[PDB]
Amino acid sequence: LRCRLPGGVITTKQWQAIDKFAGENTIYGSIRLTNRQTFQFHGILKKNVKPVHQMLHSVGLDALATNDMNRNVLCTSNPYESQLHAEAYEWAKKISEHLLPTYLPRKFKTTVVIPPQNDIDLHANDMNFVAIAENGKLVGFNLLVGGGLSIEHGNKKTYARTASEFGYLPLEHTLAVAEAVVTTQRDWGNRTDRKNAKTKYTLERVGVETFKAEVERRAGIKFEPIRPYEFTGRGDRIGWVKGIDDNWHLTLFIENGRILDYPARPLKTGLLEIAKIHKGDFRITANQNLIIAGVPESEKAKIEKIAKESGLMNAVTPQRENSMACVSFPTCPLAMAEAERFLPSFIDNIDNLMAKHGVSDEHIVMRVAGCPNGCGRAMLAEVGLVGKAPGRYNLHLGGNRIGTRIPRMYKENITEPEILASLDELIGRWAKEREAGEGFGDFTVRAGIIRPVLDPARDLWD
Ligand code: SRM
Ligand code: SF4
Ligand SMILES: [K+]
């Protein structure tokens, strides 16, 4: 089961309660951070179905209704301009409440984004509010609509799509624009085929300008031109970063977001002990990591000692920090190939390739989905693996670091040794032929290794 938790923000009181439930009332005993900034339990003792909704209520949390088609609303967790988080989080939470129960055809995903960071992967979402600020205060949002990554193997009527720019709106019209987008999707969405009901398909059927025009009419606003924004990356800021005031944020890399006491690495007990002394709250990131947020400088050495000792600060390569996998087996009923349990050893092999070609300090945004529903967001990666059968994946290449391009399929239905043999060849070509600061995804496009995806509804499929 899964929780509503806008922006990933969770208090220490809430953390201790979900930690107790996980340890005592689930089969796996783990807390799993998701890439939509919330958490999951796995294998709830069906003896404890009622107790989980009361445990959650006991600390001020609610679970979504699965008939309810909205999902968790994301918000940039660790903005470089640290003062912007409070206003942005406030709006993510406002949008979240405003869309709580208008029955939708398909599920609906929303984000609040703070440039230059695209950690929340806006182009995977139906509705995106890109924050624009003046003098350290929010003034409004650029609206991008119509992203979604789910596809069906072999079905060229399905496709991943990035999101389309509509225009800028002042802060005052946010809730109105949000509802206008939702109801327009609700009314114009396909009533015959579930598989065609997503906003990306509606937008392609009626045209972007037709959809934008209806949203303007319903919201009683006109869109201003887009105000300038640029993204520089999608990773988390692992380690200490200086927040506002004398506060500090410690971002901890958690492999697969899986929080459990392991031999010599008591990740779950360490976070408990941190929770009990930490003066602030936690932030779950869209990269399945955890921020100890708002640590006063005086408290840094105490927090870091616990995290150090528990294994929560074991150093990993930049590659491993920028790699992700969905849950997949053993718990997902839709899974086709391993993802979570495949990734650690697969990145071991990638680490070796990266060292052998002398690029062990750089990274390739690399992701694995266990099936083409796309939960791992493989369809926005530089290198994406999409599960097809046990041990077999479609290999996609040619996304970019900032997640604004769909990678085209490169090789179909191949095994891990075959994937590694191909990546070895390509990483070597990249190591020697790349220009200054050129990403691997961009390189495969430039070197003619793969043709880019320019208009996915039309040219994703060869
Ligand atoms: C946990 C998570 C992956 C992760 O490793 O973090 C996940 C796990 C599952 N997703 Fe998801 N999805 C997760 C992010 C996503 C995202 C990525 C995102 O939202 O940023 C996508 C792709 C973007 C998109 O929606 O287009 C995604 C698209 C889906 C879909 C396909 C939806 C569609 O439009 O066709 C399904 C299957 C379905 O809905 O029928 C799905 C279904 C599932 C289910 C519930 C499988 C099922 O229907 O029984 C998975 C449960 C596995 C398990 O045992 O835990 N999940 N799923 C993410 C939890 C997020 C959350 O808290 O709400
Ligand atoms: S992508 Fe497929 S396998 Fe991976 S979690 Fe989502 S549904 Fe399960
Ligand atoms: K992670």
Q: What is the DSSP string of 416-436?
A: HHHHHHHHHHHHHHHHHH--T
Q: Within 10 A of 215 (CB to CB), how many other CB atoms are there? A: 25
SS3 at position 458: helix
Technique that determined the structure:
X-ray
d(CA 225, CA 212): 13
Q: Tell me which ligand sits closest to the C-alpha of residue 257.
A: 3
CA-angle at 120, arms to 164 and 456, nearest 5°: 35
Residue type, 124: A
Tell me if residue 276 is catalytic.
no
What's the token pair of residue 316?
Answer: 């990993």
Residue type, 189: G
Residue type, 308: K
Spatial CA neighbour of 31 closest among 280, 251, 289: 289
Determine contact, residues 406/454, Cβ cutoff 8 Å: no
Size of the chain in residues: 462
Q: Which of 234, 326, 401, 405 is catalytic?
A: 326
d(CA 50, CA 356): 53
Task: Look up residue 73 and give its DSSP letter.
Answer: P
Looking at 201-277, which runs of residues are DSSP E strands?
Answer: 239-242, 247-252, 258-259, 261-262, 265-266
Tell me if residue 75 is catalytic.
no
Question: For the chain, after which residues does the C atom lie more than 2.5 Å from the next written residue's N, i.e. where is it broken?
Answer: 66, 101
- Atom 6 of ligand 2 has which residue's CA nearest to it? 375
Spatial CA neighbour of 347 closest among 411, 284, 253: 253
Task: Look up residue 224 and give its DSSP letter.
Answer: B
Identify the burial level of 345 via C-beta atoms within 10 angstroms of its C-beta, where 0-12 means exposed, 13-18 middle and 19 or more buried. exposed
Tell me if residue 2 is catalytic.
yes
Determine contact, residues 69/106, Cβ cutoff 8 Å: yes
Cβ-Cβ contacts under 8 Å for 152 (sequence gap 6 or more): 158, 195, 372
Compute CA distances 196 → 78, 166, 187, 190, whole Å: 35, 22, 14, 6
Spatial CA neighbour of 420 closest among 358, 345, 369: 345
Q: Tell me which ligand sits closest to the C-alpha of residue 372.
A: 2
| Ligand 2 centroid, distance to 219 Cα (angstroms) | 35
Q: Write the DSSP assignment of 317-359 as a string of letters.
A: -HHHHTEEE---TTT-TT-SS--TTTHHHHHHHHHHHHHHTT-
Neighbouring C-alpha atoms within 13 Å toward the C-beta of 30:
19
Determine contact, residues 120/289, Cβ cutoff 8 Å: no
Ligand-binding annotation for 371, yes or no, is yes
| Ligand 3 centroid, distance to 374 Cα (angstroms) | 17
Q: What are phi and psi of 355, to 5 degrees?
A: -65, -45
Rg (the chain; Cα; Å):
21
Identify the burial level of 340 via C-beta atoms within 10 angstroms of its C-beta, where 0-12 means exposed, 13-18 middle and 19 or more buried. buried
Q: Which of 106, 234, 283, 371 is catalytic?
A: 371
**Resolution of this entry in Å?**
1.7
Domains in the chain: ranges and CATH: 1-66+233-316 (3.90.480.10), 67-232 (3.30.413.10), 317-459 (3.30.413.10)
Neighbouring C-alpha atoms within 13 Å toward the C-beta of 302:
12
Ligand-binding annotation for 326, yes or no, is yes
Tell me if residue 3 is catalytic.
no
Spatial CA neighbour of 160 closest among 152, 172, 150: 150
Neighbouring C-alpha atoms within 13 Å toward the C-beta of 234:
28
Q: Which of 71, 106, 161, 268 is catalytic?
A: 71
Residues 177-208, buried b or exposed e (16+ Cβ, 10 A)? bbbbbbbbbbebbeeeeeebbbbbbbbbeeee
Compute CA distances 435 → 400, 446, 447, whole Å: 15, 10, 11
Distance, first Cα to last Cα, the chain = 38
| Ligand 3 centroid, distance to 214 Cα (angstroms) | 39
SS3 at position 96: helix
Determine contact, residues 344/324, Cβ cutoff 8 Å: no
Q: Tell me which ligand sits closest to the C-alpha of residue 123.
A: 1
What's the token pair of residue 438?
Answer: 């050129």
Spatial CA neighbour of 145 closest among 173, 176, 187, 177: 177
